[PDB]
Amino acid sequence: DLKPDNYFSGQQLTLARAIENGEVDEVIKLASGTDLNKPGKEDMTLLFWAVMNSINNQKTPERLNVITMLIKAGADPLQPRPQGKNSPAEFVLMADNADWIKAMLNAGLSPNAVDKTFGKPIIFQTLEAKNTKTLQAMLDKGADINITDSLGNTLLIDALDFHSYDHVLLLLERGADPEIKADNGWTMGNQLQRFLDRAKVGSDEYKKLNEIKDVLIQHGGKWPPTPVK
Amino acid sequence: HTSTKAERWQARKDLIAKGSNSLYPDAQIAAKRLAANNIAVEKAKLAENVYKTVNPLEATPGVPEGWKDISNDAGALKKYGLDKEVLFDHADTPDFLARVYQPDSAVFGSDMNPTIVFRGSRQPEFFPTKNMADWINNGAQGLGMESDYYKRAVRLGSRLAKSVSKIDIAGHSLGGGLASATSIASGQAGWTFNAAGLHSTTVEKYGGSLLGEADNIQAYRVEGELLTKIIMPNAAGVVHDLPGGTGGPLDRHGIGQAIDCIEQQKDEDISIIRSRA
């Protein structure tokens, strides 16, 4: 439903048309010579254009590989958009399927990369995804499971605060360290106890919080938590 | 001529104390409500100001006198466990956006608290019916992206429950709905103005974080305003009805009428206190 002429002209438009047509070899040929990171109209970049051309019916191996080959050629998956809007890598970490982030990881994007506006590890953006697939993909590629944001929060701590319960469970199962304290002295367990104290006994949320507690204990984490100092 | 906000704040304090020390019950009652509205109208002016943020990485113009926007000061935000990144959504234009303001101690002394203030969307949309000629909407749809401002608002609530420094929550309209979620989840005091209520699906989704409490939310509303005039739950908190609105339900919804109506009530209680001199 989208037309490349609305965003690009000239050499960039010719590359945009090869992306539109899913022509991997033509993309490889043009990408070594075309300005890959100069934005077009409406904040569109050629890399976002490739993402836009690999969804729905067009989520094919070849069109996913177009993403990979653009990045290998110099397209920056961490380039921000204006006013604090996010990069293609951050954007696709929010997806419900890991095919797009994998295409980027296959081009050498670091699973420990930080974003260029805020300096926050991009893996934190997986916590807003509908399922854990993009987090799984980053962990499978070697991301530091205990990486922290600027306030000392880990993914485990942030995921519970986000109420991203399946992300919490996956992180515990993969061996995330549950005893890490953020800068404020809280562990994930401190918040888990608070959530359990506020939940309605027998509710679906109470069952899910107790599942997390059981899995925390199964993986050797301390329960009950030490009070915050 | 003019006068500094610090002088005006002190004078109002003195007037309130006159009412509270009065032997007349009506001056005493007026002094309590005047003290509440004095605080509330400051929160309401912040709730008006958040609509002026354009680039969230830049200063918001027109910040109310005696307040400072710290939304881009990471050193100041970390006192509350906040950073810049968590204050707005980043996939598209930020309809969901929070600003954090700190009061000037030279003006308010210790009478005012830091406040995080929420703005919601101007036109809520069920995601499948958005204009898919807009490429970002097309992309979010095709990538299976989750669309829920209440997730980021509840997350901020989970964080602010840990803050060692007091920080109040405030918001207008849909931002007042978000504010009430953050307030209930954190335990911090909240002020909302013509706020949206919390839908049952939202309350269920986030469990006990959105359960109970609400006693420390002051839910101000202009009598006759759109939302109360209307699966549409009531705004959470202790209702504070405001007469003196003008026009229809749409006009009365605006934050400017909320501010004006609070000022009308202050004038009214001031006149009562002055009548017992």
Author numbering:
A (entry chain I): 2 to 230
B (entry chain A): 169 to 398, 426 to 472
Wording from the paper:
To identify the Tle modification, we solved the crystal structure of the His6-lipase•∆ss-Tli complex to 1.75 Å resolution using sulfur single-wavelength anomalous diffraction (S-SAD). The lipase domain adopts an α/β-hydrolase fold with a central 7-strand mixed β-sheet surrounded by 13 α-helices. Residues Ser341, Glu393 and His448 (numbered according to full-length Tle) comprise the lipase catalytic triad, with Ser341 projecting from a classical nucleophilic ‘elbow’ that connects β4 to α7. The lipase-immunity protein interface is extensive (~3,900 Å2), corresponding to 14.9% of lipase domain and 17.1% of ∆ss-Tli surface area. The inner helical layer (α8, α10 and α12) of the immunity protein solenoid accounts for most of the contacts with the lipase, though the long loop connecting the 2nd and 3rd ankyrin repeats also forms several hydrogen bonds. Strikingly, lipase helix α6 is pulled away from the main body of the domain through interactions with ∆ss-Tli. Surprisingly, Tle appears to adopt an activated conformation when bound to Tli, because the lipase catalytic triad is exposed to solvent in the crystal structure. The crystal structure also reveals an unusual interaction between the positively charged sidechains of lipase residues Arg180 from helix α1 and Lys461 in helix α13. Fo-Fc difference maps show continuous electron density between these sidechains, suggesting that the residues are covalently linked. The +36 Da mass shift observed in the modified lipase domain is consistent with a methylglyoxal-derived imidazolium crosslink (MODIC), and MODIC fits well into the electron density bridging Arg180 and Lys461.
Here, we show that AGE crosslinking is harnessed to activate an antibacterial phospholipase effector protein deployed by the type VI secretion system of Enterobacter cloacae. Endogenous methylglyoxal reacts with a specific arginine-lysine pair to tether the N- and C-terminal α-helices of the phospholipase domain. Substitutions at these positions abrogate both crosslinking and toxic phospholipase activity, but in vitro enzyme function can be restored with an engineered disulfide that covalently links the N- and C-termini. Thus, AGE crosslinking serves as a bona fide post-translation modification to stabilize phospholipase structure.
